[PDB]
Ligand binder design. Structure first.
Ligand SMILES: [Zn+2]
Length: 424
């Protein structure tokens, strides 16, 4: 099973579950943050995500007279040791909700074991390199008394707080010369900027027809489902199958589509449901061939890899087997690996269709939109998810004990006014 560690924000760095980490995009800069290992290979760093931004973006800040513009700021978020501990406790709760079902637990399980390949396209086929931003992050072994000393460690995902726009959660991969290991079959450390209190709002549902408007109503989203959505992106990224830039233009507005503006393929598969039906098999088959070709490169690499210069302490054979398991490659009598179409298709299918937003919501009794094709509406600020009188690990918002377990009354804005606010 998957263990979800526990900790208070003020605990002491133990060089194991609590450390000072140099995030991927700060490699070799000497900048460390306090990182908490919520599970093996997954870390939480309650800090704003400032990479690519300037300390001016973080607060266009209005105040007197302001109602939307769809984007939302709060230069103050995460600005105290306590807020950090809140965020930290909130995430832990979400993960625990995630883990409350075998389906979510399996997702996490797959994320933890999806170790990134030791290297990228820049690495020689006969080599294993661990000295790169997408394979490791430095931990600060040296005491608090200056003189920096560091140890490089393996990681899989790093969840930071939000960037300038709070309602803009995103999963991020590492590119060098605009080539993404997380897109070339290697896999690489994934990162995310997440904000659990500000949740989306939707009304594209009740896809039932045969009587005027196919039902309206207004519901907000379940933070845990929102998070799992991103976690699906993370999974694709660690296996290196994150679809590369590929916009999908719908050729017809079907009953479940509220909107009609093109969406990224990556989003259509992650969402699942009926969304990838909007993708032409032409295109759909090419993505598949795409993955295959990439793994063909990984398998070849593992048959030629012979050493790890970056680290003489790595048993090439050991890891050479872990990846065999990761990618489901079969071994022959020569000790050489190859791809089994039968098993390869089970993996692809599981990675591309086993975990989707639709079937997860469906399995968790969570109410979500009818398609990724939906209008964006003002998000809302959940008062306090750490209050089982409003949000629980088992049922989330639709709490049976509060008579909110029916028709997702727990998620209906008109019904559960008490759990949220209107931000501004
Ligand atoms: Zn997404």
């Amino acid at each position: 099973p998957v263990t979800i560690n526990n900790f208070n924000y003020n605990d002491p760095i133990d060089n194991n579950n609590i450390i000072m980490m140099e995030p991927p995009f700060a490699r070799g800069t000497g900048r460390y943050y306090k990182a908490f290992k919520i599970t093996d290979r997954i870390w939480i760093i309650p800090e704003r995500y400032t990479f690519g931004y300037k300390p001016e973006d973080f607060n266009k800040s209005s105040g007197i007279f302001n109602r939307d513009v769809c984007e939302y700021y709060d230069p103050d978020y995460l600005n105290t040791n306590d807020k950090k501990n809140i965020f930290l406790q909130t995430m832990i709760k979400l993960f625990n909700r995630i883990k409350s079902k075998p389906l979510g637990e399996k997702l996490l399980e797959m994320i933890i074991n999806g170790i990134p390949y030791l290297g990228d396209r820049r690495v020689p086929l006969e080599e294993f390199n661990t000295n790169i931003a997408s394979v490791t992050v430095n931990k600060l072994i040296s005491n608090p008394g200056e003189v920096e000393r560091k140890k490089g460690i393996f990681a899989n995902l790093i969840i930071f707080g939000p960037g300038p726009v709070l309602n803009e959660n995103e999963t991020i991969d590492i590119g060098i010369q605009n080539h993404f290991a997380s897109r070339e079959g290697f896999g690489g450390i994934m990162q995310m900027k997440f904000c659990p209190e500000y949740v989306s709002v939707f009304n594209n549902v009740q896809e039932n027809k045969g009587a005027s408007i196919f039902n309206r109503r207004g519901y907000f989203s379940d933070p845990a489902l929102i998070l799992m959505h991103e976690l699906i992106h993370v999974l694709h990224g660690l296996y290196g199958i994150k679809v590369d830039d590929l916009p999908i233009v719908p050729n017809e507005k079907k009953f479940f589509m509220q909107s009609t503006d093109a969406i990224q393929a990556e989003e259509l598969y992650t969402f699942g449901g009926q969304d990838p039906s909007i993708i032409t098999p032409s295109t759909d088959k090419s993505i598949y061939d795409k993955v295959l070709q990439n793994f063909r490169g990984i398998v070849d690499r593992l048959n030629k890899v012979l050493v790890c210069i970056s680290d003489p302490n790595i048993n090439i054979n050991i890891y050479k087997n872990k990846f065999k398991d990761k990618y489901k490659f079969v071994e022959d009598s020569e000790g050489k690996y190859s791809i089994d179409v039968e098993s390869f298709d089970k993996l692809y299918k599981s990675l591309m269709f086993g975990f989707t937003e639709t079937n997860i919501a469906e399995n968790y009794k969570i109410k979500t939109r009818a398609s990724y094709f939906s209008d964006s509406l003002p998000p809302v600020k959940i008062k306090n998810l750490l209050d089982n009188e409003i949000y629980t690990i088992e049922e989330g918002f639709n709490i049976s004990d509060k008579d909110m377990e029916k028709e997702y009354r727990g998620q209906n804005k008109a019904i559960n006014k008490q759990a949220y606010e209107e931000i501004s």
